[PDB]
Amino acid sequence: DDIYKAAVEQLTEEQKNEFKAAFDIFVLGAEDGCISTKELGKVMRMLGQNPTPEELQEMIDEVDEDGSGTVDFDEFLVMMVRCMKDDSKGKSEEELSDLFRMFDKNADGYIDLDELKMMLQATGETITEDDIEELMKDGDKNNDGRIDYDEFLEFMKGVE
Protein backbone atom coordinates (compact mmCIF):
# COMPACT_ATOMS: atom_id res chain seq x y z
CA ASP A 1 0.00 0.00 0.00
CA ASP A 2 1.99 2.97 1.30
CA ILE A 3 5.21 1.00 0.81
CA TYR A 4 4.70 0.71 -2.96
CA LYS A 5 3.99 4.41 -3.50
CA ALA A 6 6.73 5.43 -1.06
CA ALA A 7 9.30 3.34 -2.93
CA VAL A 8 7.95 4.90 -6.14
CA GLU A 9 7.55 8.37 -4.60
CA GLN A 10 10.87 9.55 -6.05
CA LEU A 11 9.52 8.61 -9.49
CA THR A 12 6.92 10.34 -11.66
CA GLU A 13 3.78 9.06 -13.44
CA GLU A 14 5.94 6.68 -15.50
CA GLN A 15 4.67 3.96 -13.18
CA LYS A 16 1.33 4.39 -14.93
CA ASN A 17 3.20 4.31 -18.24
CA GLU A 18 4.53 0.88 -17.28
CA PHE A 19 1.03 -0.10 -16.15
CA LYS A 20 -0.32 0.94 -19.55
CA ALA A 21 2.43 -1.02 -21.31
CA ALA A 22 1.61 -4.10 -19.24
CA PHE A 23 -2.08 -3.68 -20.05
CA ASP A 24 -1.15 -3.40 -23.74
CA ILE A 25 0.66 -6.71 -23.24
CA PHE A 26 -2.75 -8.16 -22.31
CA VAL A 27 -5.63 -5.76 -22.99
CA LEU A 28 -4.27 -3.40 -25.65
CA GLY A 29 -7.08 -1.49 -27.33
CA ALA A 30 -8.78 0.68 -24.71
CA GLU A 31 -11.83 2.53 -26.03
CA ASP A 32 -12.94 5.02 -23.38
CA GLY A 33 -9.47 6.09 -22.32
CA CYS A 34 -11.30 6.58 -19.00
CA ILE A 35 -11.61 4.39 -15.91
CA SER A 36 -12.08 0.78 -17.01
CA THR A 37 -10.21 -1.86 -15.01
CA LYS A 38 -12.72 -4.72 -15.07
CA GLU A 39 -11.54 -5.77 -18.54
CA LEU A 40 -7.87 -6.27 -17.67
CA GLY A 41 -8.64 -8.20 -14.49
CA LYS A 42 -11.20 -10.31 -16.34
CA VAL A 43 -8.59 -11.13 -19.00
CA MET A 44 -6.21 -12.09 -16.19
CA ARG A 45 -8.94 -14.35 -14.79
CA MET A 46 -9.68 -16.01 -18.14
CA LEU A 47 -6.31 -17.75 -17.81
CA GLY A 48 -7.88 -20.55 -15.79
CA GLN A 49 -8.83 -19.43 -12.29
CA ASN A 50 -12.28 -19.13 -10.73
CA PRO A 51 -14.40 -16.34 -12.27
CA THR A 52 -15.06 -13.47 -9.89
CA PRO A 53 -16.02 -10.05 -11.31
CA GLU A 54 -16.97 -8.78 -7.84
CA GLU A 55 -13.27 -8.01 -7.37
CA LEU A 56 -13.38 -6.11 -10.67
CA GLN A 57 -16.38 -4.09 -9.47
CA GLU A 58 -14.64 -3.37 -6.16
CA MET A 59 -11.48 -2.11 -7.86
CA ILE A 60 -13.41 -0.09 -10.46
CA ASP A 61 -15.49 1.49 -7.68
CA GLU A 62 -12.60 2.26 -5.31
CA VAL A 63 -11.45 5.03 -7.67
CA ASP A 64 -14.59 7.16 -8.04
CA GLU A 65 -15.97 8.39 -4.72
CA ASP A 66 -15.51 12.18 -4.89
CA GLY A 67 -18.93 12.44 -6.53
CA SER A 68 -17.65 14.56 -9.42
CA GLY A 69 -17.28 11.34 -11.44
CA THR A 70 -13.59 11.90 -12.19
CA VAL A 71 -10.94 9.19 -11.84
CA ASP A 72 -7.56 10.91 -11.57
CA PHE A 73 -4.15 9.27 -11.48
CA ASP A 74 -4.13 10.16 -7.78
CA GLU A 75 -7.47 8.36 -7.58
CA PHE A 76 -5.76 5.33 -9.13
CA LEU A 77 -3.13 5.62 -6.39
CA VAL A 78 -5.88 5.74 -3.75
CA MET A 79 -7.54 2.68 -5.29
CA MET A 80 -4.26 0.75 -5.32
CA VAL A 81 -3.38 1.62 -1.73
CA ARG A 82 -6.97 0.87 -0.64
CA CYS A 83 -7.52 -2.48 -2.37
CA MET A 84 -5.05 -3.93 0.16
CA LYS A 85 -4.84 -1.87 3.35
CA ASP A 86 -2.07 -2.37 5.91
CA ASP A 87 -1.38 0.79 7.98
CA SER A 88 -4.94 2.09 7.89
CA LYS A 89 -7.52 3.51 10.32
CA GLY A 90 -5.07 6.22 11.32
CA LYS A 91 -3.30 3.45 13.22
CA SER A 92 -4.74 3.49 16.75
CA GLU A 93 -8.22 4.79 17.49
CA GLU A 94 -6.94 5.54 20.99
CA GLU A 95 -4.76 8.17 19.34
CA LEU A 96 -7.96 9.35 17.66
CA SER A 97 -9.57 9.72 21.09
CA ASP A 98 -6.51 11.64 22.30
CA LEU A 99 -6.75 13.97 19.31
CA PHE A 100 -10.48 14.46 19.89
CA ARG A 101 -9.70 15.35 23.51
CA MET A 102 -7.16 17.84 22.16
CA PHE A 103 -9.96 19.26 20.00
CA ASP A 104 -12.33 19.49 22.99
CA LYS A 105 -10.23 21.53 25.37
CA ASN A 106 -13.61 22.76 26.63
CA ALA A 107 -14.31 19.10 27.53
CA ASP A 108 -17.92 19.56 26.40
CA GLY A 109 -18.02 16.40 24.28
CA TYR A 110 -19.08 18.32 21.15
CA ILE A 111 -16.59 19.71 18.65
CA ASP A 112 -18.03 22.99 17.40
CA LEU A 113 -17.30 25.12 14.34
CA ASP A 114 -14.71 26.97 16.42
CA GLU A 115 -12.87 23.78 17.38
CA LEU A 116 -12.59 22.41 13.84
CA LYS A 117 -11.81 25.87 12.47
CA MET A 118 -8.93 26.42 14.90
CA MET A 119 -7.62 22.90 14.33
CA LEU A 120 -7.56 23.52 10.58
CA GLN A 121 -5.93 26.90 11.20
CA ALA A 122 -3.26 25.16 13.29
CA THR A 123 -2.75 22.76 10.40
CA GLY A 124 -3.12 25.82 8.17
CA GLU A 125 -4.70 23.83 5.34
CA THR A 126 -6.03 25.99 2.50
CA ILE A 127 -9.41 24.43 1.67
CA THR A 128 -12.20 26.37 -0.03
CA GLU A 129 -15.31 27.33 1.92
CA ASP A 130 -17.26 24.94 -0.30
CA ASP A 131 -14.83 22.19 0.71
CA ILE A 132 -14.93 23.61 4.24
CA GLU A 133 -18.67 22.97 4.39
CA GLU A 134 -18.19 19.60 2.68
CA LEU A 135 -15.70 18.48 5.33
CA MET A 136 -17.90 19.93 8.07
CA LYS A 137 -20.88 17.85 6.95
CA ASP A 138 -18.49 14.90 6.66
CA GLY A 139 -17.87 15.44 10.35
CA ASP A 140 -21.18 17.03 11.33
CA LYS A 141 -23.34 14.36 9.73
CA ASN A 142 -26.59 15.71 11.20
CA ASN A 143 -25.36 19.26 10.45
CA ASP A 144 -26.12 20.85 13.83
CA GLY A 145 -22.80 22.59 14.50
CA ARG A 146 -21.65 19.97 17.01
CA ILE A 147 -19.36 16.97 16.52
CA ASP A 148 -19.19 14.11 19.02
CA TYR A 149 -16.63 11.32 19.07
CA ASP A 150 -18.62 9.31 16.51
CA GLU A 151 -18.82 12.25 14.10
CA PHE A 152 -15.09 12.90 14.49
CA LEU A 153 -14.42 9.24 13.72
CA GLU A 154 -16.63 9.48 10.64
CA PHE A 155 -14.76 12.58 9.48
CA MET A 156 -11.40 10.92 10.17
CA LYS A 157 -12.64 7.54 8.93
CA GLY A 158 -10.08 6.13 6.55
CA VAL A 159 -7.81 9.04 7.49
CA GLU A 160 -4.15 8.43 8.30
Binding site: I3, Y4, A7, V8, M44, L47, N50, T52, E54, E55, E58, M59, E65, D66, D72, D74, E75, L77, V78, M80, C83, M84, G90, E95, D98, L99, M102, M119, L120, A122, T123, E125, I127, D150, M156, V159, E160
Partner: protein, 126 residues
Amino acid sequence: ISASRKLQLKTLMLQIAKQEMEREAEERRGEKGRVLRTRCQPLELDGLGFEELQDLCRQLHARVDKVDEERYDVEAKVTKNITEIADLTQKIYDLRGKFKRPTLRRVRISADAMMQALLGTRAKES
Protein backbone atom coordinates in the same frame (compact mmCIF):
# COMPACT_ATOMS: atom_id res chain seq x y z
CA ILE B 1 -9.28 18.30 -5.61
CA SER B 2 -7.59 14.90 -5.71
CA ALA B 3 -8.43 12.02 -3.38
CA SER B 4 -4.72 11.39 -2.79
CA ARG B 5 -4.32 15.13 -2.23
CA LYS B 6 -7.01 15.20 0.46
CA LEU B 7 -5.60 12.02 2.01
CA GLN B 8 -2.17 13.67 2.18
CA LEU B 9 -3.76 16.78 3.70
CA LYS B 10 -5.46 14.61 6.34
CA THR B 11 -2.12 12.89 6.99
CA LEU B 12 -0.49 16.28 7.56
CA MET B 13 -3.35 17.24 9.89
CA LEU B 14 -2.72 13.98 11.75
CA GLN B 15 0.96 14.89 12.06
CA ILE B 16 0.04 18.33 13.41
CA ALA B 17 -2.37 16.83 15.95
CA LYS B 18 0.20 14.20 16.96
CA GLN B 19 2.77 16.94 17.52
CA GLU B 20 0.27 18.89 19.62
CA MET B 21 -0.43 15.77 21.69
CA GLU B 22 3.31 15.29 22.15
CA ARG B 23 3.47 18.91 23.33
CA GLU B 24 0.65 18.10 25.75
CA ALA B 25 2.61 15.10 27.06
CA GLU B 26 5.74 17.22 27.50
CA GLU B 27 3.70 19.77 29.46
CA ARG B 28 2.17 16.96 31.53
CA ARG B 29 5.53 15.42 32.44
CA GLY B 30 7.07 18.81 33.22
CA GLU B 31 4.19 19.70 35.52
CA LYS B 32 4.49 16.21 37.01
CA GLY B 33 8.11 16.86 37.92
CA ARG B 34 7.27 20.33 39.23
CA VAL B 35 4.42 19.13 41.46
CA LEU B 36 6.44 16.13 42.64
CA ARG B 37 9.28 18.40 43.73
CA THR B 38 6.82 20.85 45.29
CA ARG B 39 4.53 18.55 47.29
CA CYS B 40 7.28 16.29 48.62
CA GLN B 41 9.01 18.18 51.41
CA PRO B 42 12.74 17.51 51.00
CA LEU B 43 14.95 15.27 53.08
CA GLU B 44 16.25 17.73 55.67
CA LEU B 45 18.71 15.27 57.21
CA ASP B 46 21.58 17.44 58.50
CA GLY B 47 23.10 17.47 61.98
CA LEU B 48 20.37 15.44 63.69
CA GLY B 49 20.82 13.09 66.62
CA PHE B 50 19.05 9.76 66.71
CA GLU B 51 15.83 10.76 68.46
CA GLU B 52 14.69 13.60 66.21
CA LEU B 53 15.49 11.37 63.25
CA GLN B 54 13.20 8.71 64.73
CA ASP B 55 10.45 11.28 65.22
CA LEU B 56 10.84 12.52 61.65
CA CYS B 57 10.82 9.01 60.21
CA ARG B 58 7.69 8.09 62.16
CA GLN B 59 5.85 11.21 60.99
CA LEU B 60 7.07 10.45 57.47
CA HIS B 61 5.59 6.95 57.65
CA ALA B 62 2.34 8.39 58.97
CA ARG B 63 2.09 10.84 56.07
CA VAL B 64 3.15 8.06 53.68
CA ASP B 65 0.24 5.94 54.87
CA LYS B 66 -2.10 8.93 54.59
CA VAL B 67 -1.14 9.72 50.99
CA ASP B 68 -1.20 6.01 50.16
CA GLU B 69 -4.79 5.96 51.41
CA GLU B 70 -5.61 9.02 49.31
CA ARG B 71 -4.03 7.55 46.17
CA TYR B 72 -5.77 4.24 46.89
CA ASP B 73 -9.14 5.99 47.02
CA VAL B 74 -8.38 7.86 43.80
CA GLU B 75 -7.29 4.56 42.22
CA ALA B 76 -10.59 2.97 43.23
CA LYS B 77 -12.39 5.95 41.71
CA VAL B 78 -10.35 5.67 38.50
CA THR B 79 -11.11 1.94 38.30
CA LYS B 80 -14.80 2.75 38.69
CA ASN B 81 -14.49 5.41 35.98
CA ILE B 82 -12.75 3.09 33.53
CA THR B 83 -15.25 0.31 34.21
CA GLU B 84 -18.06 2.77 33.53
CA ILE B 85 -16.30 3.96 30.37
CA ALA B 86 -15.92 0.39 29.11
CA ASP B 87 -19.54 -0.47 29.91
CA LEU B 88 -20.89 2.67 28.25
CA THR B 89 -18.61 2.09 25.27
CA GLN B 90 -20.29 -1.30 25.01
CA LYS B 91 -23.66 0.44 25.34
CA ILE B 92 -22.90 2.93 22.55
CA TYR B 93 -21.54 0.09 20.42
CA ASP B 94 -24.81 -1.76 21.01
CA LEU B 95 -26.58 1.39 19.85
CA ARG B 96 -24.04 1.67 17.00
CA GLY B 97 -22.96 -1.87 16.17
CA LYS B 98 -25.26 -4.51 14.71
CA PHE B 99 -24.88 -4.05 10.95
CA LYS B 100 -21.27 -2.92 11.36
CA ARG B 101 -20.10 -6.53 11.30
CA PRO B 102 -17.31 -6.80 8.72
CA THR B 103 -18.86 -8.11 5.52
CA LEU B 104 -15.61 -9.09 3.82
CA ARG B 105 -15.15 -11.78 1.18
CA ARG B 106 -12.06 -13.92 0.58
CA VAL B 107 -12.76 -14.35 -3.14
CA ARG B 108 -11.13 -10.91 -3.31
CA ILE B 109 -7.54 -11.95 -4.02
CA SER B 110 -4.84 -9.54 -2.89
CA ALA B 111 -3.50 -7.61 -5.87
CA ASP B 112 0.16 -8.21 -4.98
CA ALA B 113 -0.36 -11.98 -4.87
CA MET B 114 -2.17 -11.93 -8.23
CA MET B 115 0.62 -9.85 -9.77
CA GLN B 116 3.33 -12.17 -8.45
CA ALA B 117 1.46 -15.27 -9.63
CA LEU B 118 0.86 -13.88 -13.12
CA LEU B 119 4.31 -12.30 -13.51
CA GLY B 120 6.55 -14.40 -11.29
CA THR B 121 8.87 -12.04 -9.42
CA ARG B 122 8.73 -8.81 -11.47
CA ALA B 123 6.08 -7.30 -9.18
CA LYS B 124 8.51 -6.01 -6.58
CA GLU B 125 6.61 -3.05 -5.16
CA SER B 126 3.31 -4.88 -4.64
